[PDB]
Write a protein that binds this ligand. Sequence first.
Ligand SMILES: O=C(O)c1ccccc1S
Ligand SMILES: [Zn+2]
Length: 258
Amino acid sequence: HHWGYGKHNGPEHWHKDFPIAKGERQSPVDIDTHTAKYDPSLKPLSVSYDQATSLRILNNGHAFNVEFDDSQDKAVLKGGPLDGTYRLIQFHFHWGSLDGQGSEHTVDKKKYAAELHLVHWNTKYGDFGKAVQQPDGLAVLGIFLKVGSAKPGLQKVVDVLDSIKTKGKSADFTNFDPRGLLPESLDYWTYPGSLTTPPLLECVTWIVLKEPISVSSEQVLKFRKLNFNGEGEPEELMVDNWRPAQPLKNRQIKASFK
Ligand SMILES: O=C(O)c1ccccc1S
Ligand SMILES: [Zn+2]
């Protein structure tokens, strides 16, 4: 009776094993666009993915992670609200059973079909396991997905999902360029928060891009064919792997843009 996204083990249950679920800086949150303040002092955001080295794709039983070589400064996030250098370790998505839900963050209560999380760790802490124990350990770039035109740069991801249908399956996934998942504009909102999955650690500087990317209905349908279960277990479609918005408490959301 491990955590998940079902009636008996979903987000409303997580606080029993993970009391930080009711903490002071939980994610996601609703972004109230009229309350977010422009912060002219945010430095420009720097997303440097030219030398990124993807390795593998893994179905971990709650999402799929595209993993990178993070043993050198190859793919880094800098600038914006951040002090120092954050290294890309993985990306994953959260998505819905239907196009009208799936994102974790909301914008004026609007839900997107899905949300991409590009996860980076602060190099001053040496490794990801140490970084998640620090209040400035991670920087996550959050990107909304809406259903419309296909995203060409997503198709290589979509096409390998049949090979990692069930929990614990992985596949080689080299030479994937995450620049093909970014929208035109880097305008963003930022606030201090948490992992959206257990263990819900309060270690994340969230950087949520305002401009969504468009994916096709056929692309997100292939996400929804994944399974939460292992091979030879009863089939449970991997859908609605999102946590709903949490109380903002004593936080301010800052905007990079007027
Ligand atoms: O899903 C996770 O475990 C996660 C991990 C790192 C950063 C963000 C998230 S939401
Ligand atoms: Zn996530």
